[model samples]
Target: MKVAGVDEAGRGPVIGPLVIGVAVIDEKNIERLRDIGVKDSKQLTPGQREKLFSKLIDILDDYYVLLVTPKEIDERHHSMNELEAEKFVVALNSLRIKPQKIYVDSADVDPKRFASLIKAGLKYEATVIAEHKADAKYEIVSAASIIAKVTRDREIEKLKQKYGEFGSGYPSDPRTKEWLEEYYKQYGDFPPIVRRTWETARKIEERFRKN
Candidate 1:
């Protein structure tokens, strides 16, 4: 049986693409993933995640990655919660791969509710298993997480090369906020990577306008 795991990276970041990755593997190959030291992306070091990502690509039968930009995320946030939008994107992308069973890391407080919502949106029939911390619990999910994270990190590195350091593209990071504030001051608009609809963005705009 072919089972696929889905997970995302950069969901909480104020900049960069929100990447969702799915990996399909059989039970036999799934054990090979665990043997390679794959675990939750959050728990693994950057180097470890990169190593596992390469191994995952070598072992997986197939993989899918969806890159959702700030513009797309902002537009979706106007119509649906970010988590719901994420689920919709995942469902749409996962359907293309057509796995027998799809496991997802739960985005909502209620895992069943999130799973049901995604299942309702899907056109095909597949078991949707949503679990809390699935990235840590399932080898497939961990593989997906590693891929998603490494992909996003690579994107961020490219952006940094072009735009300079942005402190991980999170509002909670003072350097990121500083970068936004400086860009807004110079251009009178946040850059494409900035989530202008985010609360931090709104505050930055307010401060900019006042100045």
Candidate 2:
């Protein structure tokens, strides 16, 4: 039997894309995943996670990634919670070989509600198990989380290459906060890479916009 896991990275950041990663592996190969010392992405160093990322691709039955860009979030009419669940829906759908069971790390406070949304949008029948901290509990989910974290990290790097450094794109990061305010003051607008809908972005812009 094949089992799949889904998780996202960069969901809380003020910038960059929210990357949802879906990892599928046969039930029998789960031991191999654990053998590689898979755990929550945050617990692993970047070097460690990068090493496992390729190994995961080699061992998994299939995998897929869905990216929700900064601009998309800025323009979206729905809640971020809904957009995340919907991206999970699309990621699962895009997998070439569907799994019998799916485990997702829930973004919502109510795991059941998040699971219901995935089920409702899913194109095929599969058992979806959504839980808080699923990434820490399940190796498969951990694998997906690692993929997403690495993917989002790479995306941020590419943005930096094009637009120069802005730190981690999180509002809590001093560099990010400094960069946003500086960029706006320099260009009279936030970069296209910014999620203008974010309160962090709005507050920074508010600092300079009043007549």
Candidate 3:
């Protein structure tokens, strides 16, 4: 069977775009991907992922990626999970080769519910198997995760180069929090790369302005 794996990156960041990557591989070659040391993207270093990212591209029968920007994400009135599902659908539809089944790293709490959401978003028929840790359990999904991370990392790197180092863009990061507070204190608003819709930014802005 021809199967595809899907995973997303940059979903939790206060800045930058959300990226989704899909890797479609023939069932027989799925073992080859596993043999190549594919694993969860988080477990692999950036350099390792960068190398595997290109190798996966060469091995996959087809692939597709979608990047949703902060402004676009901020304007969306829908929930983040739904927005992600829409992006996944967009990516899947754009694939040059369709697969018989899709294994997705679930974005929702309930994997089955997430699978239903993806199935509903698709125009074409395919078996949707959404799992909480598909990227770790499935080699194909791990490849997708790697691709998404590499793409998002490059985007964040560009942002850092153009602006300044924002420290991974996660709210939990000290540098990101400092940058937000410092930037707002100096400029009276976020650096435009921030997703104003994010609660972290709201709290930062309110606290920074109050003090």
Give one digit per residue, the lDDT tens place, for model 1 in 1-211.
8888888888778889888877888877777887887765567788876876887799998888788888887877343344544554454555445676878888555788777777777777778898998888899988887878888999999999999898978889999989988889999998888877788998989988776
User: What ordering of candidates by lDDT runs from best to worst?
Assistant: 2, 3, 1
Best of the two (2, 3) by TM-score: 2
- Maximum-TM-score candidate: 2
| Per-residue C-alpha lDDT of model 2 across residues 64-126, encoded as one tens digit per residue | 888888899888879898888888998899988998799998855598999989999999999
Q: List the residue pairs that clash in candidate 1.
A: none
CA lDDT of every candidate: 0.79, 0.87, 0.86
Q: Which ten residues in a row have the lowest lDDT in candidate 2?
A: 37-46
Alpha-carbon RMSD of each model:
2.1, 1.3, 1.6
| Candidate 3 Cα RMSD (Å) | 1.6
Q: Write the per-residue lDDT of candidate 3 for residues 136-174, one digit (tens) a residue.
A: 888989888888888989988999999898898998999
- At residue 87, what lDDT does model 1 achieve? 56
lDDT of 3 at 64: 82
Query: Residue 146 in model 2: shift from native, Å?
Result: 0.7
lDDT measured at residue 81 in model 1 versus the true structure, 0 to 100: 42
